[PDB]
Each structure stands twice: as C-alpha cells, then as structure tokens.
C-alpha cells in the first residue's frame, strides 16, 4: 500500500507483513486485544522515526510509537487496526555519563535493561516500575510507580530532557528551559504529543541494601477489611510511613498482604515498621535483605531481567482497571469490603488488587508541585492511594467479565466526588469512552493538555481511542 511504498522510498527499515518478525512485532501484551497495523516501521535512529512520521502524514494514516508494548489496551498498536506502528525496540541503548550521572536512554529500552546498565556501570538508578519487560517510553511518559516511588517519586520525575519528533516531522528538545509547554505535556500525557526519540534521565545513587518484607492481613471478612484499611489509611495520612519505606497491599481471593521494600537493612526496617505492626496487631514475615539488583529481581516476577531481545513475546489475557483516591470514608470502605468478600472472592478467574501506599506527608510522589507536569495526581492528602485491579483469564476472556471490575470500581466512585478520584493510564482501561478517559486520566490538567494538543498535533496524527482531543479554536 501507499504507506509501504513511502517508507521504502524514504529508506525506513520495516517489518514486512510476510516476514517471521511480523507476528512478534505486531503482537500485543494483552492477548485479548490484538490489532493489525497498516505497517511496522523498525527505526534504528531518530532519522527513521522522522521519516516514518512524515510518511504517515503524507499518506494519511495514523501513527503510534510502540516501546515495550505493555499497554493494557494495546494503544502502542494504535488501539484499533490500520495504524503505522513505529516499533522502537531495536533502539534500547543506555549510556551513563560518569560526570553528571545523567543517563541517555533510547526509547525502546525496557526497565530491566535500564536498571541493569545503570547499576552495573555506576551503581545508579532512577525510580521506576516493577516488571523488567516494560518499555521506558509508555511507562515514563504517563507516570511510573514502583518500590522506590515513596522514596524517590515516579519515573516521569527523573526525566530531565527529551528529544521529540513532532507530527510534521520537526525535531525538538523539551526540558524545563526549552519548549516548557511540551515538557509539561510530555510528563504525564506524552503519548499524545509526538514520538520521544531519546530520553535523558537524572539518577540517584542506588542504596547498597534494600529489605523486602511482607505483612499478612486477616482480611477474610468485611469488618476486618474495613477496620484494617481504616487504620492503614489514617497511619499513612498522618505521616506514619517513612521516606525509606515503599509499600502496597496485594490482595487476591486467597491471600491479602502488605508487601514492602525498605531502603535500608533489616534492623532499620524492624524499628521503622513497629508502630504499624502495633496498630494492625500483625507480624512481619519473609524479611529478606538484598543488594539493589536482587531487590529489583525479588519483585520482578520474571526470570529474565536484562531484556533486549526483539523476540520478546510475554503476554496475558485480561481486563484491568485503575483508580487514584483520597482516604476513603467508612461507607465506601464498607461497600468496597462487601464487594471484595461477597463478589470478588467468588469470581472464578485469577484476579488481584494492588493498593499502593502512594501519598501522605512523606511521599516523594506527592511532593512534586501541582504545576510541574501534566501528570495529575500530586496532592499529598487527596491523592493517597493508587490502585491496579486486574482480572486474568487463561482461556478466552469472558465477554460478561468486565462487570466484575466495573462493579468494584463503582463501589469506590459512588461515594467519592469527582475531585477525589481519578484513573491512571499506565493501567489503560479501554472500557472507558474517549471523553470519560481524558477526564479521569488527566482531571484538572485536561484543558491545558487540549490546548497544547491543538498547537502540536492539530490533525491528530498520533490518534488512539483515548487520546487527548485538540481544543477547538
Ligand atoms: C505489562 C506490564 C505493565 C506494567 C508492569 N508494572 C508496572 C509498575 O510496577 N508500575 C507502573 O506504573 N506501571 C506498570 N505497568 C504498566 C506500564 O507502566 C504501562 O503499561 C506502560 O504504559 C507501558 O509502556 P510500554 O511498555 O512502552 O508500552 P507501549 O504499549 O509500547 O506504549 C504505551 C503508550 O505509550 C506510548 N509511547 C510508547 N513509546 C513512546 C514514545 N517513545 N513517545 C511517545 N509515546 C510513546 C504508546 O504509543 C502508547 O500509547 C508490569 C507489567 C508486566
Ligand atoms: C547501540 O550501541 C552499540 C554500541 O554498544 C552500537 O553498536 C555499533 O553498531 C554499529 C552498526 O550499527 C557497528 O558499526 C559498531 O561496530 C557497533 N559498535 C559496537 C561496540 O558493537 C549500536 O549501533 C547502537 N544501537 C542503536 C540503536 O543506536
Ligand atoms: C511543525 O510543527 C511545529 C509545532 O506546531 C511548528 O512550530 C510552530 O510554528 C508556529 C507558527 O510558526 C509557531 O508560532 C510555534 O511557536 C512553533 N512551535 C514550536 C514548538 O517551535 C512548525 O512551524 C511546523 N512546521 C511546518 C513546516 O509545518
Ligand atoms: O503474578 C502476579 C504478577 O504478575 C503481578 O505483577 C504486577 C503487574 O502490575 C504491576 O503494577 C505490579 O507492580 C506487579 O506486581 O503481581 C501480583 C502477582 O499475583
Ligand atoms: O504520625 C502518626 C503517629 O503519631 C502514630 O504514632 C503512634 C501514636 O500513638 C501512640 O500510642 C503510639 O505509641 C505511636 O506509635 O502512628 C500513626 C502515624 O501516622
Ligand atoms: O472492546 C471492549 C469493550 O467491548 C468492553 O466494553 C464493556 C463490555 O461490558 C459492559 O458491561 C461494559 O460496560 C463495557 O464497558 O470494554 C473493554 C473493551 O476492550
Ligand atoms: O476529528 C477526529 C477524527 O478524525 C478521528 O477519527 C479517527 C480517524 O482514524 C480512524 O481510524 C478512527 O476510527 C476515527 O475515529 O477521531 C477523533 C476526532 O478527534
Ligand atoms: C548488602 O549489599 C551488598 C552490596 O551492596 C551485598 O553484596 C550484600 O549481600 C548485601 N547484604 C545482604 C545481607 O544481603
Ligand atoms: C471477622 O473475622 C474475625 C476473625 O478474624 C472475627 O473475630 C469477627 O467477629 C468477624 N466478624 C464478622 C462480622 O464476621
Ligand atoms: C543498619 O543500618 C543502620 C543505619 O540505618 C546502621 O547504623 C547499622 O550499622 C546497620 N546494621 C548493619 C548490621 O549493618
């Protein structure tokens, strides 16, 4: 087709439809949501990215970058058939400057590869998610929360500059001192404004020891969930969680526990966690001290860490939702608990819920000021918890299945004003319509996002079904 001929004349490397690599390059992370691209460009340099983008514009097709391919809605594939996919995973180099400790990171580098290189070359790190296969591109441009985030913030907070290919093929560098509107827009909503062709990340010195630990929670009936969560949120909101502690609740039908990573040794952790243990009447278990990389591996849930192979093919079949909330009133705690116990525990599919200890007085995430970036959830009281709800099938996903997580999310949102909750596009939920998605993902920052969108991509070349809409002028 025309897109194929344009890419060829422009000397852009591609994955041919009839090749062996098509299957790998086109395949989603979420097997529930395959899409068939118009074509797959396979850039080795920013020049190829520019030329691919220009081809999409000249020919009249939409284009989307795919970095790690982990979008829960397959938005890296375009979220529908027939987009040019700019597959970035042949571009994964990570360079660490010994002087400034700034990392130059190509946009197809996956988190495990990044973590490995930064640690091996200078014992450095930045704050990012668990999950070695996740691409830096989607992850860092929309937030990025992991077991260093209470201590050090979101992945997006470590970006110091980015080189961007715009919808008309122009190159720009965005930073605090250059294209500041674009830099603001990238840092929360970056899928909408161009293809980032190179990132520069600041780093921190990796702690020599981290300590993983667990606290089992007796959340086997509704009253125990309510009292336990009510205590936990009061503890967090009143500054109980020290900077060095990073923690979440992981629940499934068969066990509920706090899981943590403490940036320090085991004796220091025991001292730091004692107040919470006394409040919950609970005990520590599985206390394990690690070096920095073993700490990462511990929560990776993956055999491979330093992943760079273009053959990468990890995939699951699922539906997922997210939330960001304040502390929850007990009426909401009761509804959420009843749903958990009476409904979720009886669902005959693998599911889990993660409640990250996200905000409160000591969180680095919510110390970032309200105007710093488009990422919407920075209030240390109002943005207290971040949630992942995940519903996974081993066969085909049942078409009536969506009601399960939908009902659970309703148990929260029915009792919270829209100023006290949002959603998180790193757990992209294609059940939301486009208007709803923009509002819940970006909240108070949507209007300015829409204005920048009209300025930078008025034709919506980077369209996907939950993309920011350009403002009308
Ligand atoms: C599969 C998976 C996802 C995880 C895991 N663990 C996480 C964690 O511990 N914390 C988190 O905050 N998130 C976790 N996630 C979710 C991922 O963070 C999100 O799913 C990321 O958005 C995935 O990023 P990536 O792998 O790059 O996904 P893509 O599908 O390629 O892209 C998503 C989105 O971003 C746009 N995009 C990619 N690359 C670019 C560039 N270079 N420029 C602009 N826009 C870009 C895509 O077009 C698409 O819209 C653990 C697991 C197992
Ligand atoms: C990423 O880094 C490596 C260097 O480690 C680059 O490797 C060079 O690749 C070119 C061909 O592209 C060869 O001529 C050189 O011999 C390679 N050098 C080494 C040391 O192997 C690679 O090109 C870079 N990749 C990207 C996508 O930029
Ligand atoms: C490519 O798009 C960019 C961004 O929209 C254009 O740059 C803008 O041009 C307008 C009009 O001249 C200026 O007022 C803006 O300040 C520019 N923005 C930036 C970020 O520099 C650019 O003109 C476009 N190029 C072409 C050929 O269409
Ligand atoms: O087997 C499950 C893991 O696959 C799951 O992995 C989670 C993926 O989403 C990320 O945001 C989480 O950090 C990560 O733990 O963890 C739970 C486990 O049951
Ligand atoms: O910051 C808050 C602390 O003040 C609180 O500490 C407890 C206060 O009550 C006393 O009985 C206990 O000795 C002490 O641990 O813990 C919660 C935290 O958010
Ligand atoms: O394409 C999928 C949609 O069909 C799905 O829509 C949901 C179906 O079940 C209804 O009860 C829900 O209200 C509705 O949102 O959402 C997921 C998407 O991938
Ligand atoms: O005005 C914009 C429309 O042009 C855009 O239409 C999309 C174009 O790509 C097609 O594959 C989609 O199906 C179609 O919806 O929709 C968004 C709107 O802002
Ligand atoms: C603490 O860190 C060092 C390297 O920083 C590591 O080799 C050692 O095994 C760690 N200690 C424990 C108890 O795991
Ligand atoms: C919930 O379970 C606990 C045991 O952990 C029990 O003491 C309590 O009475 C139970 N409450 C109800 C209402 O079933
Ligand atoms: C644990 O950490 C503290 C500082 O937080 C340090 O003084 C102490 O020596 C450490 N313990 C061990 C066994 O290294």
From Swiss-Prot:
* Disulfide cysteine pairs (residue numbers): 6-55
Cofactor field: FAD
Is Iron one of the keywords UniProt gives this record? no
User: Which residues are noted as glycosylation sites?
Assistant: 18, 93, 168, 209, 221, 265, 283
Protein residues bound to substrate: 130, 248, 388, 427
Q: What does the cofactor field's note say?
A: Binds 1 FAD per subunit in a bicovalent manner.
Q: Does the keyword Cell membrane apply?
A: no
Q: Which SUPFAM superfamilies match?
A: FAD-binding/transporter-associated domain-like
What family does this chain come from, according to its entry?
Belongs to the oxygen-dependent FAD-linked oxidoreductase family.
Q: What does this protein do?
A: Catalyzes the selective oxidation of C1 hydroxyl moieties on mono-, oligo- and polysaccharides with concomitant reduction of molecular oxygen to hydrogen peroxide. This results in the formation of the corresponding lactones, which typically undergo spontaneous hydrolysis. Xylooligosaccharide oxidase is able to oxidize a variety of substrates including D-xylose, D-cellobiose, lactose and arabinose. The enzyme acts primarily on xylooligosaccharides, indicating that it prefers pentose-based oligosaccharides over hexose-based oligosaccharides.
**Protein name, per record:** Xylooligosaccharide oxidase
Encoding gene, per UniProt annotation: xylO
């Amino acid at each position: 087709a025309a897109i194929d001929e344009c890419l060829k004349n422009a000397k852009v490397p591609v994955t041919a439809r009839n090749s062996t690599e098509w299957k790998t390059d086109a395949s989603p992370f979420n097997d529930r949501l395959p899409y068939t691209p118009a074509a797959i460009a396979k850039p080795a340099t920013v020049e190829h990215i520019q030329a691919a983008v220009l081809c999409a514009a000249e020919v009249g097709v939409k284009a989307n970058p795919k970095s790690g391919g982990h979008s829960y809605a397959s938005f890296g594939l375009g979220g529908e058939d027939g987009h040019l996919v700019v597959e970035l995973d042949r571009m994964y180099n990570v360079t660490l400057d010994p002087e400034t400790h700034i990392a130059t990171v190509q946009p197809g580098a996956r988190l495990g590869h990044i973590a490995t290189v930064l640690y091996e070359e200078g014992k450095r790190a930045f704050s990012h998610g668990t999950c070695p296969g996740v691409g830096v591109g989607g992850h860092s441009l929309h937030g990025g929360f992991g077991f260093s985030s209470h201590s050090h913030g979101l992945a997006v907070d470590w970006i110091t500059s980015a080189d961007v290919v715009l919808a008309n093929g122009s190159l720009v560098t965005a930073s605090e001192t250059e294209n500041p509107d674009l830099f603001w827009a990238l840092r929360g909503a970056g899928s909408n404004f161009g293809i980032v062709a190179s990132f520069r990340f600041k780093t921190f010195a990796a702690p020599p020891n981290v300590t993983s630990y667990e606290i089992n929670l007796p959340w086997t009936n509704s009253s125990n969930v309510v009292k336990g969560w009510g205590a936990l949120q009061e503890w967090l909101l009143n500054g109980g969680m020290p900077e060095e502690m990073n923690m979440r609740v992981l629940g499934n039908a068969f066990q509920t526990q706090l899981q943590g990573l403490y940036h320090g040794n085991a004796s220091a952790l025991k001292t730091a966690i004692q107040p919470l243990l006394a409040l919950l009447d609970a005990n520590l278990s599985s206390v394990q001290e690690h070096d920095w990389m073993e700490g990462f591996r511990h929560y990776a849930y993956s055999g491979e860490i330093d992943i760079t192979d273009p053959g990468y093919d990890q995939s699951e079949t699922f539906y997922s939702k997210s939330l960001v909330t304040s502390a929850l009133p007990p009426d909401v705690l009761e509804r959420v608990a009843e749903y958990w116990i009476e409904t979720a525990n009886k669902v005959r599919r693998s599911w889990y819920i993660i409640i990250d200890m996200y905000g409160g007085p000591n969180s680095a995430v919510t110390r970032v000021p309200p105007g710093a970036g488009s990422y919407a959830f920075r209030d240390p009281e109002r943005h207290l918890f971040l949630y992942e709800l995940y519903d996974r099938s081993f066969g085909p996903y049942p078409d009536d299945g969506f009601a399960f997580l939908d009902g659970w999310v309703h148990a929260f949102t029915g009792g919270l004003d829209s100023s006290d909750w949002g959603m998180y596009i790193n757990y992209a939920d294609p059940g939301l319509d486009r208007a709803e998605a923009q509002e819940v993902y970006y909240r108070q920052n949507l209007d300015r996002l829409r204005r920048i969108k009209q300025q930078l991509d008025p034709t919506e070349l980077f369209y996907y079904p939950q993309a920011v809409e350009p403002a009308e002028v």
